[PDB]
Amino acid sequence: DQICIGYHANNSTEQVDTIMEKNVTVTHAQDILEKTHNGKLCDLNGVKPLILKDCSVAGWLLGNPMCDEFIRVPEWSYIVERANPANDLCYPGSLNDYEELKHMLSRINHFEKIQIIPKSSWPNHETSLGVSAACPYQGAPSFFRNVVWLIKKNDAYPTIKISYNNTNREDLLILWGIHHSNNAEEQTNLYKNPITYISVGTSTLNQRLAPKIATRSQVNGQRGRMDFFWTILKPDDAIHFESNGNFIAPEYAYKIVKKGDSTIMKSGVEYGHCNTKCQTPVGAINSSMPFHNIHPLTIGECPKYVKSNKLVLATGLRNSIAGFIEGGWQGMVDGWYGYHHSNEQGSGYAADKESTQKAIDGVTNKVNSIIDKMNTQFEAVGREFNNLERRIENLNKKMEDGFLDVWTYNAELLVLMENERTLDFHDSNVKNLYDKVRLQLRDNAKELGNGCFEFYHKCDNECMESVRNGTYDYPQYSEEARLKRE
Amino acid sequence: DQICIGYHANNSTEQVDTIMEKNVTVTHAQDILEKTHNGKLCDLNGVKPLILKDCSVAGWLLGNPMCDEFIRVPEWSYIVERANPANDLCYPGSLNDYEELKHMLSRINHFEKIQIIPKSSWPNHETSLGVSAACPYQGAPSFFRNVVWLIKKNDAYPTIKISYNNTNREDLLILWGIHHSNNAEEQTNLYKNPITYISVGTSTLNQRLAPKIATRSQVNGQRGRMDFFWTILKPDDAIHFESNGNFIAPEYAYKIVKKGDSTIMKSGVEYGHCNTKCQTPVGAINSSMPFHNIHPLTIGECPKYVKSNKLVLATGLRNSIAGFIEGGWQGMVDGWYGYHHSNEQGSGYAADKESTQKAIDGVTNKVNSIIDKMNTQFEAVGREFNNLERRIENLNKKMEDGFLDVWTYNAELLVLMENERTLDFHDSNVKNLYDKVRLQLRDNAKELGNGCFEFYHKCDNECMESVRNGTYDYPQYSEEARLKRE
Amino acid sequence: DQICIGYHANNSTEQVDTIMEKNVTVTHAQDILEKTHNGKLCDLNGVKPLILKDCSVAGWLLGNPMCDEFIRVPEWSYIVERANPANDLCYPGSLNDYEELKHMLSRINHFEKIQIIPKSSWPNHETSLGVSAACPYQGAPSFFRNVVWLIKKNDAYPTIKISYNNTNREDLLILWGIHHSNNAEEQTNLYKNPITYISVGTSTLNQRLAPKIATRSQVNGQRGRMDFFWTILKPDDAIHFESNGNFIAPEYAYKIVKKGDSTIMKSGVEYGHCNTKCQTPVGAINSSMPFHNIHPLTIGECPKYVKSNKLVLATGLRNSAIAGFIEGGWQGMVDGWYGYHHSNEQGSGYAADKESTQKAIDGVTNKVNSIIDKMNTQFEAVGREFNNLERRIENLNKKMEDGFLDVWTYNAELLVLMENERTLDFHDSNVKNLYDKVRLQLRDNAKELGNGCFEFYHKCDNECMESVRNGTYDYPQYSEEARLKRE
Ligand SMILES: CC(=O)N[C@@H]1[C@@H](O)[C@H](O[C@@H]2O[C@H](CO)[C@H](O)[C@H](O[C@]3(C(=O)O)C[C@H](O)[C@@H](NC(C)=O)[C@H]([C@H](O)[C@H](O)CO)O3)[C@H]2O)[C@@H](CO)O[C@H]1O
Ligand SMILES: CC(=O)N[C@@H]1[C@@H](O)[C@H](O[C@@H]2O[C@H](CO)[C@H](O)[C@H](O[C@]3(C(=O)O)C[C@H](O)[C@@H](NC(C)=O)[C@H]([C@H](O)[C@H](O)CO)O3)[C@H]2O)[C@@H](CO)O[C@H]1O
Ligand SMILES: *[C@@H]1O[C@H](CO)[C@@H](O[C@@H]2O[C@H](CO)[C@@H](O)[C@H](O)[C@H]2NC(C)=O)[C@H](O)[C@H]1NC(C)=O
Ligand SMILES: *[C@@H]1O[C@H](CO)[C@@H](O[C@@H]2O[C@H](CO)[C@@H](O)[C@H](O)[C@H]2NC(C)=O)[C@H](O)[C@H]1NC(C)=O
Ligand SMILES: CC(=O)N[C@@H]1[C@@H](O)[C@H](O[C@@H]2O[C@H](CO)[C@H](O)[C@H](O)[C@H]2O)[C@@H](CO)O[C@H]1O
Ligand SMILES: *[C@@H]1O[C@H](CO)[C@@H](O)[C@H](O)[C@H]1NC(C)=O
Ligand SMILES: *[C@@H]1O[C@H](CO)[C@@H](O)[C@H](O)[C@H]1NC(C)=O
Ligand SMILES: *[C@@H]1O[C@H](CO)[C@@H](O)[C@H](O)[C@H]1NC(C)=O
Numbered sequence A, B: 001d002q003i004c005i006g007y008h009a010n011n012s013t014e015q016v017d018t019i020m021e022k023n024v025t026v027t028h029a030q031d032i033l034e035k036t037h038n039g040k041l042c043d044l045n046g047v048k049p050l051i052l053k054d055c056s057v058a059g060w061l062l063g064n065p066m067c068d069e070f071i072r073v074p075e076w077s078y079i080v081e082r083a084n085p086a087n088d089l090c091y092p093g094s095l096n097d098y099e100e101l102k103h104m105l106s107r108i109n110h111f112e113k114i115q116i117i118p119k120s121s122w123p124n125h126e127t128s129l130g131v132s133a134a135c136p137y138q139g140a141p142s143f144f145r146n147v148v149w150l151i152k153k154n155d156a157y158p159t160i161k162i163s164y165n166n167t168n169r170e171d172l173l174i175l176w177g178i179h180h181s182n183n184a185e186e187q188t189n190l191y192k193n194p195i196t197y198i199s200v201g202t203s204t205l206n207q208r209l210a211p212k213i214a215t216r217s218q219v220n221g222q223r224g225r226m227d228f229f230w231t232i233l234k235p236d237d238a239i240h241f242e243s244n245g246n247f248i249a250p251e252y253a254y255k256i257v258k259k260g261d262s263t264i265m266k267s268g269v270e271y272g273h274c275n276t277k278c279q280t281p282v283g284a285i286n287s288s289m290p291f292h293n294i295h296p297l298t299i300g301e302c303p304k305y306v307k308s309n310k311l312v313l314a315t316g317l318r319n320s321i322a323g324f325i326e327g328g329w330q331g332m333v334d335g336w337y338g339y340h341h342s343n344e345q346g347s348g349y350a351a352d353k354e355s356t357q358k359a360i361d362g363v364t365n366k367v368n369s370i371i372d373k374m375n376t377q378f379e380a381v382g383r384e385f386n387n388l389e390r391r392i393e394n395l396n397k398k399m400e401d402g403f404l405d406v407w408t409y410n411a412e413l414l415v416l417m418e419n420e421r422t423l424d425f426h427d428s429n430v431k432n433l434y435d436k437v438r439l440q441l442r443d444n445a446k447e448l449g450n451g452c453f454e455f456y457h458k459c460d461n462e463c464m465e466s467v468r469n470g471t472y473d474y475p476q477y478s479e480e481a482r483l484k485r486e
Numbered sequence C: 001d002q003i004c005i006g007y008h009a010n011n012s013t014e015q016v017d018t019i020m021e022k023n024v025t026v027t028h029a030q031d032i033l034e035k036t037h038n039g040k041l042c043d044l045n046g047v048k049p050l051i052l053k054d055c056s057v058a059g060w061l062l063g064n065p066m067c068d069e070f071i072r073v074p075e076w077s078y079i080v081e082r083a084n085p086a087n088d089l090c091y092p093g094s095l096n097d098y099e100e101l102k103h104m105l106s107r108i109n110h111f112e113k114i115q116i117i118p119k120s121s122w123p124n125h126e127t128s129l130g131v132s133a134a135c136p137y138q139g140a141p142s143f144f145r146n147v148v149w150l151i152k153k154n155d156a157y158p159t160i161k162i163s164y165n166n167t168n169r170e171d172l173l174i175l176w177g178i179h180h181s182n183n184a185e186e187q188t189n190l191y192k193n194p195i196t197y198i199s200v201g202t203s204t205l206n207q208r209l210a211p212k213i214a215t216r217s218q219v220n221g222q223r224g225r226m227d228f229f230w231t232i233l234k235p236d237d238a239i240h241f242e243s244n245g246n247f248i249a250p251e252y253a254y255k256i257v258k259k260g261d262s263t264i265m266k267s268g269v270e271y272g273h274c275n276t277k278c279q280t281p282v283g284a285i286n287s288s289m290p291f292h293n294i295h296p297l298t299i300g301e302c303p304k305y306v307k308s309n310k311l312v313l314a315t316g317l318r319n320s321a322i323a324g325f326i327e328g329g330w331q332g333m334v335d336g337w338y339g340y341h342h343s344n345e346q347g348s349g350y351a352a353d354k355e356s357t358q359k360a361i362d363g364v365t366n367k368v369n370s371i372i373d374k375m376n377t378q379f380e381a382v383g384r385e386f387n388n389l390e391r392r393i394e395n396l397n398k399k400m401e402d403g404f405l406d407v408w409t410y411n412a413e414l415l416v417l418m419e420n421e422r423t424l425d426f427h428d429s430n431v432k433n434l435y436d437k438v439r440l441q442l443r444d445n446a447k448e449l450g451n452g453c454f455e456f457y458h459k460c461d462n463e464c465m466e467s468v469r470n471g472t473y474d475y476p477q478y479s480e481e482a483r484l485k486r487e
């Protein structure tokens, strides 16, 4: 007859690290790092994104002859663009303030194209010869579909003076361009006026431009250039145009309502018809964990990016007729702490749910607190700087590197500390049980020093159950123990 | 005859949360979050801020007729401006590099207005006709008070050549502008010359401008525009002007001395005859606490911004014929740990001074270290970007959000873990007292197991005080205890 | 006759601070803050930096006459420049996009100067009179050595048209400028053309410029101005020039290959002929500690910057023949951390326990090594490159630096204090464990004096004492002896 105190053990082989030891085996463990994704593009909060395929924002807006597929998108949440678009600008040139326009057009609540100036509004100018071989369409020269290129008619170029009243209830996006010739002979052949100018004016815009005739290298077989501009028109504002040559008039305008912000996404993966909350260039994330290591660039409410490859929290016990000093019992299955009973009546294991419940609740509460004490908010990450803005890009890189280092260090140190804290908490609990059963039986038995007590007298199964309950009668067997001694 | 060990208890109801349990009840607690403000604008380190009421910086500088009376306030620390100023640029137009001037005019010492070019310096030009209905004054047309609008005289407009030494010992701020006409007839009516230009040159400035004549939408009944410029003149530099029309000449200049930097606050709160160290748009704060949740935008030496609503540290014990493991003692005032005594003379309470003093010192040191290990620096937070710089604004927002998240997470985790440690720090000392008295007692008494010892022999008040002091004589009562043992 | 427990103590006077106490004396301690530097400028990863001495970047590129140090360094890691260079621009003027060019002129893999337009290519223009007193050389007027100032010849200025087709296999850097006159008479005397223009065009460049004639202040005795421009030419592109006056044609071009990125250091320290890994304007840092307080501006893989002056991590014992619960100043034990002091008729000695000491030292070493090693360090170049009209971005960067500094300082100090508190308990727990292990083996054969010793009733000699240290004790052997000794 003897009674011993031990702890649960199993065949688990999971390993964790503490501040002082490394590769400590535990019975149970939990991971708090996310490392998986679905590998597809899916909707953000029920709003389908916009996919431009092989086109670009400028080509889509200006109406490139090879990018007319996209004509119906009521709204979108973010824009997906290929890293190296093929069809961007058939005619060589540039667009002013491209990056700001892209950032503004990132997220649009409502989008619709309307016609503001019919082609019949130019009786004294030719509107059918404005084509070039640099913009082929089905093997024939063509031009942008959203603008019209005006040339002289009957060897005359009368001055142009028109204005537009905005009568719609939303803002309008308008684009126009100017063409640079190559030499004086070409300028005379195209516009008949050696000197030309363009004047554009609104309630807040005041612009005046002149052509720049010079010699330039060939791009796409053309030496000329075209520069385009854009503006936003108020609901009750008006815009006035005036020019006498080298003018590319607008034909279509876009009705735009903006009530949010986002960024532009560079990826090559395909659509997947899902709904998600966080999006990455290589897939989507559906995890509640506070840390991840998938990709730096993310859109939406996402966990924090860290460098570490493993963050495991220890939740179980230290894996390994005896006692708690030697090791953990394998015969016990229910509970974490308990007693192994043994006498002439029988043998077996009995668990102590009172402390096991407290330990389980404490561990679960710690894990839940660590997971849920993190605050997240909507964010958009991307690269939105051109060649001549390297300093700001370097500053942003400093931002990201510093934040990454801070988060990595904090997470690693927190995990390393908490593992050891949990282990010593378990040791304290088992020792508390051991001296709880102590100080009650008194001198009726002796402690072998291995975590067990050998009763001098005979303690029945009811007596042992009462001992487990915490109620024991010492004078009942005091005399039996006394004459048992020696 | 028995001696028992216990701890303090009271009628408190404060609650604190640990890493394992939520709102256990404690006797005493302290808050380390600031949530109060006076709701008024105070001076910053004894320096009056600048309040523009219903004006704007450009309107105040240029001298809008309905806006400014006179300068006052030779020095200031920061500028308070309303969200939507009413009087600003009565004549439609714009000011070049407005944001840079706004930022540079934040904190200024010895700001004084002087006159450089008297109106008598224009004998061949008209100076009393430059008025417009767009800037009325007491029901009559007027103009800006700091500049002069020049008109042709006797149907002529001779060329203007003027230069100015800066003989003063401080930097000088000068402003000028150019006017855009509407048509050729209006240009001829205002100035004889049909083609005009403006040339401005200093040791580091080289500018040449020409008017732009076009059709624009009317604002405030005027279709014209005026653009203004500014520059800083060195203490021994000179500035040269040259124009032949469409020239707005300066009349007054400001002597400026700058050392430091601040920002501009958008608020509507009134002044309160106050002196603070940290200022917010909704009020002023002074405190020593490391964290606050009042307003994201702050100026001065302010605590860190967090999102949490409650941050409470525990500085006491766990609240709830007795013993250690029963609960607290309501009846024993004046102490944290102590002994309850009961002999045949009577019963009462006594406290251990040394352990209580040590615990109080430790808790106070912990709280003071947590509060005082924080480093504070002067900072100015505000929004200083226009509509065409959205990317930098997004970068600043990412800045602020990341810092807020880091601080919130760190503060919450630290508070929880320190509460955990402090809550069970006291149990070690109480256990130490218990086994200390048990060690001195040895086997002269019997342990009831609830935290007391039943004395076999008689222990008078002198003996009881000796036991508390730590001077017990085992051989004195050993024989009596042996006889009583049977 | 008795056995006692204690711990090692010595004569060290190191002091550490915990969360609850201050001025705590410890036996051993280790610092994790770096505060020393060699005070020299040394190479970065075997690549010698570029030292410009008293010449600025613009003067070095344009070929200032007073910067005759035409030493060739094919590859450099970073640029060292004085705070206030003296020889910058002999002729007053400005350089467009100066800051971007300076940023791009950081670490360069390959650099070489070649001639693209010989002076013989101007038969109808004068190329020998383009000198000024503002650029002296050995007491004579001179000009920049990389550009040519063209003047009218035979009272005529024919229009200039030229192109250059890039046959090299690397990118090319080209610079050109335009001169502003003072009045109509000077313009007529210099170029004979009242109205002039400059046209430059490449596959991606389209620029047109016109002179601005006005009255300006006198700088270096000259009232004129000169504005310069730069561009990058692709390996198979060409550049076309066209002007009729006020033109400064290029003569030499730079052939450049760029791979990485760096910044510019402002310092006055001398060269040191080293090979370091982290650089600082006041010296070089050679250390593995995670924190330092030398200088905010650094280049390369460097530790974090904090405002603290001391960061000491406790790794020893509480410094101050009975011990265990009274002062454990056992100066006799000099061979371990925990042990026993024994005494009987044969003699006395200070034995030590190897297992507990090994466990404690392994744990402390693992803690210190983990704290030191769990640092992520990446290459970062920190500088201050912003002009007078970009103060807002500079303020943003300053806020960045201040916030990061505050976060790191607070975290480091709190971690150090808390870890010292944690470490100052493990030793006491080990001592207590050893004490109870010593107990429950003698049971009732000895009297626990409570001062930290046990006094055996029976007679135990050196062999029995060694056995009880070994963990093997024969209780029944001396049970009857303890019984008869008990009164
Ligand atoms: C060896 C020889 O003589 N070869 C010529 C060959 O050079 C010539 O090419 C024409 O060259 C001009 C440049 O001087 C243009 O590039 C012509 O291109 C087109 C185009 O882009 O399709 C023709 C088109 O009709 C034009 N459109 C309008 C609205 O005017 C445009 C336009 O002029 C330019 O783009 C303006 O910059 O140019 C190109 O064909 C050919 C002519 O066919 O003849 C060979 O013999
Ligand atoms: C139905 C009808 O015929 N109504 C006219 C009415 O249009 C006309 O108005 C004047 O209109 C002109 C535009 O053509 C200007 O807007 C006049 O404005 C003033 C002003 O701002 O007060 C007059 C002032 O004297 C001018 N100041 C100077 C220094 O020259 C300025 C100046 O010309 C402009 O601001 C330059 O852009 O304009 C406005 O009064 C009136 C004329 O009284 O007659 C009605 O019959
Ligand atoms: C901690 O105290 C709060 C009381 O402030 C308890 O939270 C309340 O829970 C009830 C129902 O469970 C809700 O109806 C209240 O709205 C809660 N109060 C607040 C302020 O949210 C909470 O239960 C306590 N903690 C635990 C573990 O019981
Ligand atoms: C503005 O006036 C000052 C003072 O008269 C001029 O500085 C003087 O210049 C003359 C000749 O240039 C010197 O002889 C004096 O010694 C200078 N005086 C001082 C106090 O420096 C200055 O030149 C004038 N401005 C300009 C543009 O010439
Ligand atoms: C008072 C006077 O007439 N002085 C002139 C000098 O100005 C002149 O020096 C030349 O001045 C021009 C400016 O007009 C220019 O700066 C030349 O570079 C400079 O050499 C000098 C010529 O030798 O003659 C004096 O009489
Ligand atoms: C800890 O375990 C891992 C996994 O097997 C192993 O790679 C590593 O070397 C171990 N560490 C030590 C110090 O042995
Ligand atoms: C545009 O038309 C509306 C409708 O009459 C009018 O109110 C508005 O003034 C017009 N815009 C301008 C600039 O006159
Ligand atoms: C995400 O995962 C959860 C399980 O963790 C699953 O129930 C859910 O359907 C998944 N998808 C979404 C959109 O939440």
Ligand SMILES: *[C@@H]1O[C@H](CO)[C@@H](O)[C@H](O)[C@H]1NC(C)=O
Pocket (backbone or CB within 6 Å): B011, B012
């Ligand atoms: C708690 O007890 C103190 C001690 O007298 C008393 O002053 C206080 O009012 C009591 N509080 C409550 C809520 O009863």
Ligand SMILES: *[C@@H]1O[C@H](CO)[C@@H](O)[C@H](O)[C@H]1NC(C)=O
Pocket (backbone or CB within 6 Å): B286, B287
């Ligand atoms: C903070 O404000 C209070 C007024 O509510 C004032 O009594 C206190 O003295 C202030 N703090 C300091 C340091 O002056």
Ligand SMILES: *[C@@H]1O[C@H](CO)[C@@H](O)[C@H](O)[C@H]1NC(C)=O
Pocket (backbone or CB within 6 Å): C011, C012
């Ligand atoms: C401390 O002890 C060491 C070890 O012998 C000795 O070398 C050193 O000189 C001592 N220091 C002092 C100040 O006595």
Ligand SMILES: *[C@@H]1O[C@H](CO)[C@@H](O)[C@H](O)[C@H]1NC(C)=O
Pocket (backbone or CB within 6 Å): C022, C023
């Ligand atoms: C701790 O030591 C320093 C250094 O000698 C001393 O200045 C400081 O006052 C000490 N702390 C206390 C509380 O005395």
Ligand SMILES: *[C@@H]1O[C@H](CO)[C@@H](O)[C@H](O)[C@H]1NC(C)=O
Pocket (backbone or CB within 6 Å): A217, A218, C165, C166, C236, C237, C238
């Ligand atoms: C430069 O030379 C190559 C060599 O054939 C030629 O193909 C290329 O067209 C030339 N560049 C230009 C702009 O013509």
Ligand SMILES: *[C@@H]1O[C@H](CO)[C@@H](O)[C@H](O)[C@H]1NC(C)=O
Pocket (backbone or CB within 6 Å): C275, C276, C286, C287
């Ligand atoms: C860096 O410090 C270590 C440690 O003393 C030394 O061995 C090494 O030589 C140092 N490196 C250089 C380049 O001096």
